[PDB]
Amino acid sequence: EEEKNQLEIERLEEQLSINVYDYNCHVDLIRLLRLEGELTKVRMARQKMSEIFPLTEELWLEWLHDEISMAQDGLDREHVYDLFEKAVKDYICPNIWLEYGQYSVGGIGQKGGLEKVRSVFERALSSVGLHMTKGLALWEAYREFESAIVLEKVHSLFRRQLAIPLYDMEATFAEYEEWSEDPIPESVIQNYNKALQQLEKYKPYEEALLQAEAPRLAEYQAYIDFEMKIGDPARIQLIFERALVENCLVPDLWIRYSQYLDRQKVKDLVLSVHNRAIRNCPWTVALWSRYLLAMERHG
Numbered sequence: 001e002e003e004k005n006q007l008e009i010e011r012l013e014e015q016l017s018i019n020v021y022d023y024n025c026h027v028d029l030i031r032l033l034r035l036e037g038e039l040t041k042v043r044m045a046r047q048k049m050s051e052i053f054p055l056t057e058e059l060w061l062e063w064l065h066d067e068i069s070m071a072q073d074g075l076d077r078e079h080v081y082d083l084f085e086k087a088v089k090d091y092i093c094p095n096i097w098l099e100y101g102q103y104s105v106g107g108i109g110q111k112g113g114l115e116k117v118r119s120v121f122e123r124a125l126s127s128v129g130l131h132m133t134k135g136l137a138l139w140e141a142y143r144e145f146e147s148a149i150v151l152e153k154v155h156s157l158f159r160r161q162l163a164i165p166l167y168d169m170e171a172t173f174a175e176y177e178e179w180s181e182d183p184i185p186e187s188v189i190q191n192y193n194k195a196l197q198q199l200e201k202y203k204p205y206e207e208a209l210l211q212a213e214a215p216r217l218a219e220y221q222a223y224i225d226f227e228m229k230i231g232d233p234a235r236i237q238l239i240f241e242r243a244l245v246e247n248c249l250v251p252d253l254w255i256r257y258s259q260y261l262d263r264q265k266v267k268d269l270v271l272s273v274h275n276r277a278i279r280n281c282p283w284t285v286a287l288w289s290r291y292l293l294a295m296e297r298h299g
């Protein structure tokens with residue numbers, strides 16, 4: 001069935017030359033070639049797809065996994081890091097960050113390898129460390145890394161985490177008590193209580209998301225309203241980003257994120273968000289207008 005396959009490879013290719021904006025054709029084309037072992041054409045197809053489209057976490061991770069295995073030396077490794085840097089730009093991506101962290105720990109023996117690992121985890125925590133269901137895996141991964149080389153930094157990460165509302169933060173408090181020789185300070189006990197209060201406050205909104213059907217737009221918009229009432233810029237940014245993972249083809253959501261950012265010392269953030277907006281909703285003239293106004297405003 002090689003001739004059968006090659007025929008449908010050529011058909012999909014012709015269909016892409018007819019219309020490059022056919023997402024499923026790209027995916028179908030790439031799926032074949034990975035099985036067929038045409039490693040060169042798979043990489044080229046992935047490169048071309050990723051120029052045209054923002055990719056989901058799953059699509060990125062399939063690519064990254066193949067490239068990790070094929071990387072043999074320090075230079076190949078750097079090109080894999082370049083691929084991670086491209087990968088993390090599209091949407092918030094806790095699993096890509098976890099894999100970036102693990103790959104970096106794999107390269108610990110590179111010169112500067114320790115700094116690279118800590119940079120990766122700190123950057124991950126900056127993006128997803130407040131994520132109520134998915135942030136905890138990154139705090140735990142970072143603590144397991146820091147433990148495996150000591151141990152004040154592990155105290156730091158327990159205490160930093162416990163100031164933040166996350167699911168299973170009760171278990172982390174118990175863990176920290178049992179782990180710590182000394183007892184936990186009062187300030188950290190006080191912030192933990194404040195964080196538990198926050199957690200309870202957010203629980204109805206999280207439950208609404210989990211209960212509602214995908215892509216749960218109304219439940220996201222209500223959560224966004226709620227966080228915008230509360231006013232923490234990091235939290236507002238996070239909820240927009242969570243909503244956009246599932247609602248990336250909704251121009252109104254990007255526009256709302258853009259309006260919020262028009263009221264902010266954050267040039268790099270503003271311009272990266274607008275680029276992502278036009279990659280996801282390229283037919284929306286208002287988003288292109290907004291992107292160019294933002295560039296002028298920040299020039």
Ligand SMILES: [Cl-]
Binds near residue numbers: 116119120123
């Ligand atoms: Cl880095």
